[PDB]
Structure formats: structure tokens, C-alpha cells
């Protein structure tokens, strides 16, 4: 299938309490592989997956210096954006960026992206063409114009088509036994009483990688998406994921409901019911 290299970066001011906190977290398909955090005892880029330990000290020193440079850059940005928005120096504010690329199974670029947010709202973003920017407001129009004079977009484009994709392939190769694996979901059903002669059936899926999964409830063959509680798929602390979907059904009728679990790790979708 396709794969992706993604960085989530945040800088958040805290007036009165020193310099902004700056964080970079990197992912290859749903697994955390690197991290920078300005509040660490010693702020350096560090591995977050065992396969990255193979990268030598030149990798770690380069990425560390890049991250410290990015930190100062975002510190300036925070000051700048107080000016654009006519805001005071006493409040805390947040810049977020998502930056990365996806390649298809042939190892070629499918899409690149770089989007920024300020205080939780769209700010500026590179378009799919990798040539122009969409500014969400007029503060961001100032940025758009600065970035257009500086050739920022072809600079970014060159990273996305060049460095980003080339490092993704490297990571997928060096970490293939972790990244290219599939852990199949193991599933079960729990049962809970409700008032009014009804019952919650909850279908659980545990232990799976990658994160993409689909849980449905059925009755005769109709999917009951119209009466389903669920949680977003979530990490379980060891590089695998979990999910549940529930449905409310009449007491004594729970044997006609089936949970179905769809995952790329499974040779065929799982089917199960409540076990009394």
C-alpha cells in the first residue's frame, strides 16, 4: 500500500514563564519514530522507534540543529502574529504545522502538504499543486506575500519531491520489519444492561497494526450505522491500536446481531456475536 512521512509541530507561548515550548513529533504510517521537545532535560532529536537507533550521530546532530533553528523561527513567528492580529503580550498562543509526504506502493510521490494553524484555526497552507498558497485570512495574506517573494514554495516543493520522499523510503527500508508488518485484530463482545428492557452490545478490536480498521454491526445483513456509538481508533502503548463500536438492542434479541471486523491483516473479515 501507500506510506507517509508526517511531522506535527507546535510552538506555544507562555508569557511570564520563559520562552515558548516547541515540539516536533515524527511518524511513518501511524508509528512515532522521532521527537524533539524544548522542555526536555537536554533538548535533542531522539529516536522513538528501535529501527532509528541504526542512524548514526550525523543524523541526530543534523536534525537536532534543524529543530533548534525551527524553534527560533517559530518564536519569531509568535511575536510577528501578535502584530498581525493586534494582540497583547500577556496571552498564550499556539502555532501548529503539519508537514509531510505520502508515496504510493511504487515509492513515488502521491501528495505533499504543509499546513499552518494559529490558535486552532487555519492560517496558511500549500495547495496540492505545490506552487501556491491558500491564506485563510488577511493576516495570512501578509505571510503569503512574504513567502512568494522569497521563493518559499519551490523551496518547499523541492523538499517534498526530493528529501521527504527519499528519507521516507530510507525509513521504510531500515524499519521494514516494524513498518511493513500487519498485526491482526483479535475481537470480542461485551454486554451491558440498560433501563427499559434494552441492552448495549459493545464490539472490541484489540492488538492491530496498521491503525486503519472498520467495525460494523449487522442484523440479517443490514448495517446498523444509524444506532452506533464508537470511539476513534486509539493507540494501546506498544505500537498497536484498538477500537470499539456499540449498539443498543432489545433484551433477548442480541443473538441476531453480528459484529464484523475489517482489517488488512485479516485474510477474511471477522464475524462474531455475544457469548453468554
Amino acid at each position: 500500500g501507500p506510506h507517509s512521512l508526517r511531522y506535527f509541530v507546535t510552538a506555544v507561548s507562555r508569557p511570564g514563564l520563559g520562552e515558548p515550548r516547541y515540539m516536533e513529533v515524527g511518524y511513518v504510517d501511524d508509528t512515532e519514530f522521532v521527537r524533539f521537545d524544548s522542555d526536555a532535560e537536554n533538548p535533542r532529536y531522539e529516536p522513538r522507534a528501535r529501527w532509528m537507533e541504526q542512524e548514526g550521530p550525523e543524523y541526530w546532530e543534523r536534525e537536532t540543529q534543524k529543530a533548534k533553528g525551527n524553534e527560533q523561527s517559530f518564536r519569531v513567528d509568535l511575536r510577528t502574529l501578535l502584530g498581525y492580529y493586534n494582540q497583547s503580550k500577556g496571552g498564550s498562543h499556539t502555532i501548529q504545522v503539519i508537514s509531510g509526504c505520502e508515496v504510493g506502493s511504487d515509492g513515488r510521490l502521491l501528495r505533499g502538504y504543509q499546513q499552518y494553524a494559529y490558535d486552532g484555526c487555519d492560517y496558511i497552507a500549500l495547495n496540492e499543486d505545490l506552487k501556491t498558497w491558500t491564506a485563510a485570512d488577511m493576516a495570512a495574506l501578509i505571510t503569503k506575500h512574504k513567502w512568494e517573494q522569497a521563493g518559499e514554495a519551490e523551496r518547499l516543493r523541492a523538499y517534498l519531491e526530493g528529501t521527504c520522499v527519499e528519507w521516507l523510503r530510507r525509513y521504510l527500508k531500515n524499519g521494514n520489519a516494524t513498518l511493513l508488518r500487519t498485526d491482526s485484530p483479535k475481537a470480542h463482545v461485551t454486554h451491558h444492561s440498560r433501563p427499559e428492557d434494552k441492552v448495549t452490545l459493545r464490539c472490541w478490536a484489540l492488538g492491530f497494526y496498521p491503525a486503519d480498521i472498520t467495525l460494523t454491526w449487522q442484523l440479517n445483513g443490514e448495517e446498523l450505522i444509524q444506532d452506533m456509538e464508537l470511539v476513534e481508533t486509539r493507540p494501546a502503548g506498544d505500537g498497536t491500536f484498538q477500537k470499539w463500536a456499540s449498539v443498543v438492542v432489545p433484551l433477548g434479541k442480541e443473538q441476531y446481531y453480528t459484529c464484523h471486523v475489517y482489517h488488512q491483516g485479516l485474510p477474511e473479515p471477522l464475524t462474531l456475536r455475544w457469548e453468554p
Partner: peptide, 8 residues
């Protein structure tokens, strides 16, 4: 592997 970000 990460980008060097520009100032706004």
C-alpha cells in the same frame, strides 16, 4: 527528514 521552516 524534517523541513527547515520559514518565518511568517
Amino acid at each position: 527528514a524534517v523541513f527547515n521552516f520559514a518565518t511568517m
